[PDB]
Structure 1
Amino acid sequence: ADVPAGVQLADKQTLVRNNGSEVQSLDPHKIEGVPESNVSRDLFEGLLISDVEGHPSPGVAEKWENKDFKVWTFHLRENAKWSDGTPVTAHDFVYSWQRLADPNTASPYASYLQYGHIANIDDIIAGKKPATDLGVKALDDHTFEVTLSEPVPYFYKLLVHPSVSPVPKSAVEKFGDKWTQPANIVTNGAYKLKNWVVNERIVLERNPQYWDNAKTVINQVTYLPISSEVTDVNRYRSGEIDMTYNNMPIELFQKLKKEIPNEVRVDPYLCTYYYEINNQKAPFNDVRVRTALKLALDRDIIVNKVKNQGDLPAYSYTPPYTDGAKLVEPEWFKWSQQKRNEEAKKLLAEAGFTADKPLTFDLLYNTSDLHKKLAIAVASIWKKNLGVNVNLENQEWKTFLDTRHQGTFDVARAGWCADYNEPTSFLNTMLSDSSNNTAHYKSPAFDKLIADTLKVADDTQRSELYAKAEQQLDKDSAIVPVYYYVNARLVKPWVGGYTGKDPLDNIYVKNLYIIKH
């Protein structure tokens, strides 16, 4: 943390943050969500990290170079250490990235190494080559070298993500799935795991072995798993919680902005809210059905009337303000909702649906006051505008993610937030073979458009190809875009260091501090 001259620090430097739900895991190769990543950043540190405003900056790697954007060499700082005092080396990274690639690990982020194009990854994921053939090597204890199969100018931006953080081989091998228990875990970020009570709390304490430990201010941070946004706000206002999670309750938001305006932080966020259609399941394998659902949803009502927190109506998957996005707004987005509804009803009529044999399916969402209110609104809109019936179903966060991976669903609410600020952070997740593809969408034309983006060595051709990739996704109605998120949360006046400038919201508790109050 960089405490400004003249600020007086509180005697007790502890922080309590709400974190939305119980995490899937603390193992960096088994996680895929925001709640998980929030804790991961305080515990595991990769080659690069985001600074307080979001810029890619030195992590374990203090400096790096590239040859032709294809061979990347990372010089690791000599004092990087794990919490047990052992050095962090390039061998930790070789083992870690191989473990991420290995199909036996079944990482939901195994495809992250395809997004960076590390050599031999396709073959490794397919089981044709062992994970030890991955294009990584330790040239020495402090030098990690990555070889890509084609030039990737933005490759280093990918490296702040939890999937490419190191994991401690000896703990993994000795304890298997219990390596992340407090008595067994070993970490290399600014914090160490002190306590982990499922469905109650996660408590982290400063890691004195962290190389940048002299600059860490917060000595302990607790992450809570509260999925009720009302309860989160209530426990913030009662004094228990210093930072809420960033899901705000429809019941209280407008009142909160009038009551404690300086605490309500609302900033740009590179996430898209959408309804994920299971593309492989009848009748959702019919484009007419997907298009109908997409069109009949009234984004103005959802965004301006039901949520009303500053989000923007969406007509794409990639947010239009992503660095490198120059998207073309489809004509259907400029039609009236009435015209959208007529087109929707006609397509369902064409698809074989009638008043007597209507379209009925499930709408799955992770337990939440906000997502339940949004799902109820969407259900009513779809009923009214299109004559479709939906059965709402809630599931705890971890189970919800697994259901979508299993494809044991019809439609599900969903949010994707960038991992790196570049359109492929979104678009690569719709590739046929992507491990993050829970839409179960498979388009050879879409796959080709993205594949062509690294075959050109020009930004304008790349941007035009992303725009066309979004047009292919839209033409196929792979998803139902709802809105581009704003990042809205409550933050006590005494929490310093949170700028709100990072559009990815990659917060590190090592960068915060408690002002005397």
Structure 2
Amino acid sequence: QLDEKQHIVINNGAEPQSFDPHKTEGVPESNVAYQLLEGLVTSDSEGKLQPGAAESWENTPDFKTWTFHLRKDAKWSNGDPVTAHDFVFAWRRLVDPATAAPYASYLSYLQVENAQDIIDGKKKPAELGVEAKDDYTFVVHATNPVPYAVSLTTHQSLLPLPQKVVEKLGDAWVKKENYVGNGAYKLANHIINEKIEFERNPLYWNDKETVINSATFLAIENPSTDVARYRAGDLDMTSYGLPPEQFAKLKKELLGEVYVTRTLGTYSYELNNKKAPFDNVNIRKALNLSLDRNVITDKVLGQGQTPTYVFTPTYIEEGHLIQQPAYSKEPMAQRNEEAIKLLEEAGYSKANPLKFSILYNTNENHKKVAIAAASMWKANTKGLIDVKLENQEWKTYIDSRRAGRYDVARAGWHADYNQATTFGNYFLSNSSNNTAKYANPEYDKAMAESYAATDAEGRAKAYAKAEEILGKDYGIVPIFNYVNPRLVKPYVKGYSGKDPQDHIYLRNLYIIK
């Protein structure tokens, strides 16, 4: 009882910055890229790893050499061959400073030889420690043991690009008219702020197992709008936010359609550490003391989000030694008194309060959390803090964070791979992902001496120390560990509710009748 049509409409939640995987860093972007392109390895509905462009792979016993065997007859959507040269080209372009990739640092996380030096402009991109041993053998050379390397390769930043096309056309290769990819789908249409339309890529190596023939991604920013369209039956899966007010109702009324995936994600307010006055540790500490997490998780959202005071989710692999900081165990009244003293010491008063804006991406749930935070900060400090809200469109919000044009910004980080360092690495001084501009050489040293570590206990202790240092510096304001609530029509199959990264590959779905 497979449906005859096999069409699906999904809310992607925003207009993506770009379809170039080297120019982007967000979930709307990766969701698109993952339909059009495929890296060495990919995943099933529960996030378990399965062959992608590589049909086979192995590692040396020291976990430093990774050899990928590519498919000898695999073709790009235009019929050009997919070779290890495309991977060499793409990974070089990622770390090349002229690309200005937001995820430039990702191959540094993988410990690829010379990756950090290329990022720092000290070596040329061609000096990166990856190679096409022949057209269908791609080898990756790491300077330290990286036993979790395969899982890293599934990330959008490590997707290959069609070298011959990109070289001919430059950055104009991403135009719908020119876009060539090696994933299960290709672009049929793109209307800015409205819809992206996908069609089968018939040259996909695994096209014979693809079931969905076509799909539409919408760009609905507000969960209530999302939910109304679902109810009208004009889309089949919502994005991963739902209205907290409607939620208990939706669960019972639309029983079996409400999915809630426990995800490897942390929601935070990021403090601009190099802008006055958030360069003052004392002020960063005040904000942390005075913000009640349980108010947001329990009363503003109440969907299963759990309160947290560290960046790494402690339930991630090798995260188990990370401790919640001591102040989180103190009464709020004790916390609030400390915050007021600190703010008074920094020269704030009811007459002259600490004034700043929360920047967030347009989204009613974010607005709700911002209003609560603003509200808690004023009341909890008896008028020493006065907060405004600045909402921006997704692309504009990303540009602002990246450019440092913010005081405090809503921030979500979802694991790029199921191991602690996907969070740990974010806060390195030199990480291209560090929009906080947090910099502590003791943090960097804690993480650096972890890559050397040979067993999981040793790595786990270093990550606990890194967290303790970020904690004492009050680098950001962690709030909660994510849950991913979505509505999914009963006739949509292949969505598990068990993928810790909550990826959606069209090629994993099918419609039943």
Q: TM-score, normalised by structure 1?
A: 0.97
CA shift digits 1:210-250 (9 cap, x unpaired):
01110000001111111011111111110111000001123
| 1:509 Cα offset (Å) | 0.7
CA contact 1:190–1:210 (8 Å) conserved in 2:
yes
1:294 and 2:258 matched: no
Give the equivalent residue in structure 1 for 2:16.
Answer: 23
Query: 2: distance between equivalents of 1:396 and 1:177?
Result: 23
Give the equivalent residue in structure 1 for 2:483.
Answer: 486
SS of the equivalent of 2:78 reads: coil
Give the equivalent residue in structure 1 for 2:455.
Answer: 458
CA shift digits 1:396-416 (9 cap, x unpaired):
001111111110110001100
Query: 1: distance between equivalents of 2:55 and 2:254?
Result: 41
Letter of the aligned partner of 2:379 in structure 1?
K
1:310 to 304, 307, 310: 304
Q: Which segment is superposed worse, 47-56 or 364-373? A: 47-56
Give the equivalent residue in structure 2 for 1:384.
Answer: 379
Give the equivalent residue in structure 1 for 2:32.
Answer: 39
Give the equivalent residue in structure 2 for 1:4.
Answer: none
Letter of the aligned partner of 2:67 in structure 1?
T
Query: 2: distance between equivalents of 1:114 and 1:79?
Result: 31
Letter of the aligned partner of 2:315 in structure 1?
Y
1:446 to 443, 446, 449: 443
CA contact 2:79–2:203 (8 Å) conserved in 1:
yes
Give the equivalent residue in structure 2 for 1:335.
Answer: 330
Query: 1: distance between equivalents of 2:239 and 2:45?
Result: 18
SS of the equivalent of 1:139 reads: strand
1:213 and 2:207 matched: yes
Give the equivalent residue in structure 2 for 1:471.
Answer: 468
Query: 2: distance between equivalents of 1:101 and 1:186?
Result: 22
Give the equivalent residue in structure 2 for 1:374.
Answer: 369
2:350 to 342, 351, 355: 355
Give the equivalent residue in structure 2 for 1:5.
Answer: none
Q: Which segment is superposed worse, 77-86 or 280-289? A: 77-86
Unaligned runs of 5+ in 1: 1-7
SS of the equivalent of 2:76 reads: coil
CA contact 1:230–1:251 (8 Å) conserved in 2:
no
CA contact 2:10–2:236 (8 Å) conserved in 1:
yes
2:425 to 428, 436, 449: 428
Letter of the aligned partner of 1:55 in structure 2?
K
CA contact 2:155–2:416 (8 Å) conserved in 1:
yes
Query: 1: distance between equivalents of 2:333 and 2:170?
Result: 56
1:107 and 2:104 matched: no
Give the equivalent residue in structure 2 for 1:503.
Answer: 500
Query: 1: distance between equivalents of 2:497 and 2:386?
Result: 40
Query: 2: distance between equivalents of 1:425 and 1:460?
Result: 17
| 1:93 Cα offset (Å) | 0.3
Query: 1: distance between equivalents of 2:506 and 2:108?
Result: 30
Give the equivalent residue in structure 1 for 2:397.
Answer: 400
TM alignment of 1:66-465, pairs within 5 A: 66-67=59-60, 68-326=62-320, 327-386=322-381, 387=383, 388-465=385-462
SS of the equivalent of 1:401 reads: helix
Query: 1: distance between equivalents of 2:420 and 2:253?
Result: 38
Query: 1: distance between equivalents of 2:330 and 2:92?
Result: 49
Query: 2: distance between equivalents of 1:261 and 1:438?
Result: 40
Query: 1: distance between equivalents of 2:17 and 2:170?
Result: 16
Query: 1: distance between equivalents of 2:159 and 2:50?
Result: 14
Letter of the aligned partner of 1:47 in structure 2?
L
Letter of the aligned partner of 1:375 in structure 2?
A
SS of the equivalent of 2:241 reads: coil
Q: Which segment is superposed worse, 97-106 or 354-363? A: 354-363
Question: What RMSD over aligned residues (CA atoms) do the two structures have, in Å?
Answer: 1.0
| 1:108 Cα offset (Å) | 0.1
Query: 2: distance between equivalents of 1:128 and 1:190?
Result: 38
Query: 1: distance between equivalents of 2:325 and 2:27?
Result: 30
Q: TM-score, normalised by structure 2?
A: 0.98
Letter of the aligned partner of 1:20 in structure 2?
G
Identity of aligned residues (%): 57
Letter of the aligned partner of 2:146 in structure 1?
V
CA shift digits 1:483-513 (9 cap, x unpaired):
0010111000000011111101122110100
SS of the equivalent of 1:179 reads: helix
Query: 1: distance between equivalents of 2:255 and 2:313?
Result: 27
Query: 2: distance between equivalents of 1:263 and 1:502?
Result: 17
Task: State the aligned residue count.
Answer: 509
Query: 2: distance between equivalents of 1:481 and 1:342?
Result: 20
Q: Which segment is superposed worse, 52-61 or 425-434? A: 52-61
CA contact 2:97–2:121 (8 Å) conserved in 1:
yes
SS of the equivalent of 1:118 reads: coil
CA contact 2:38–2:182 (8 Å) conserved in 1:
yes
| 1:174 Cα offset (Å) | 2.7
CA contact 1:204–1:222 (8 Å) conserved in 2:
yes
| 1:127 Cα offset (Å) | 1.4
Query: 2: distance between equivalents of 1:22 and 1:177?
Result: 19
Query: 1: distance between equivalents of 2:193 and 2:145?
Result: 44
CA shift digits 1:175-222 (9 cap, x unpaired):
323211221010100001111111011101111100111000000111
| 1:171 Cα offset (Å) | 2.3
CA contact 2:290–2:376 (8 Å) conserved in 1:
yes
Letter of the aligned partner of 1:29 in structure 2?
H
Query: 2: distance between equivalents of 1:251 and 1:176?
Result: 47
Query: 2: distance between equivalents of 1:280 and 1:423?
Result: 26
SS of the equivalent of 2:153 reads: helix
Query: 2: distance between equivalents of 1:413 and 1:367?
Result: 11
CA contact 1:66–1:72 (8 Å) conserved in 2:
yes
| 1:53 Cα offset (Å) | 1.3
Unaligned runs of 5+ in 2: none
